[model samples]
Target chain A: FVNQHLCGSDLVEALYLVCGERGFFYTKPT
Target chain B: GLLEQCCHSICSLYQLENYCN
Candidate 1:
């Protein structure tokens, strides 16, 4: 669950898959 | 059964399963 690098891919893919055609937008921390 | 028993144990298990490998 806390694999650092894998977390990014996991989160992005999960978001995309779950979001479907909704499309998502994110902002990075400064 | 029409109802499911949901307690702290079930919540913990679900959280663990969702967050763990």
Candidate 2:
């Protein structure tokens, strides 16, 4: 189910790492 | 590259789901 899909703390933390490395505003879709 | 990228996204989505559960 779609509801089953949600980022967890670890995944969110990893995402934050990528965001920091790549630049959140630059990499994330507008 | 696009197909691979999409597949990666899907896997990431699944991982996210698993994490949620």
Candidate that would win on DockQ: 2
- lDDT score, candidate 2, position A4: 28
Give, for candidate 1 chain A, the lowest lDDT window spanning 10 residues: A1-10
Model 1 TM-score, 2 decimals: 0.30
**Alpha-carbon runs more than 4 Å astray in model 2:** A1-7, A21-30, B1-21
Candidate lDDT scores, in order, read: 0.30, 0.33
lDDT top scorer: 2
**How many clashes in each candidate?**
0, 0
Task: Residues B1-21, candidate 1: write the lDDT tens digits.
Answer: 000112111222222233322
* Tens digits of per-residue lDDT for model 1, A1-30: 232222333333444444535554322322
What iRMS does model 1 reach? Answer: 12.9
Native contacts retained, all candidates in order: 0.00, 0.00
Docking quality level of the chain pair in candidate 2: incorrect
Q: Each candidate's interface RMSD, rounded to one decimal?
A: 12.9, 9.9
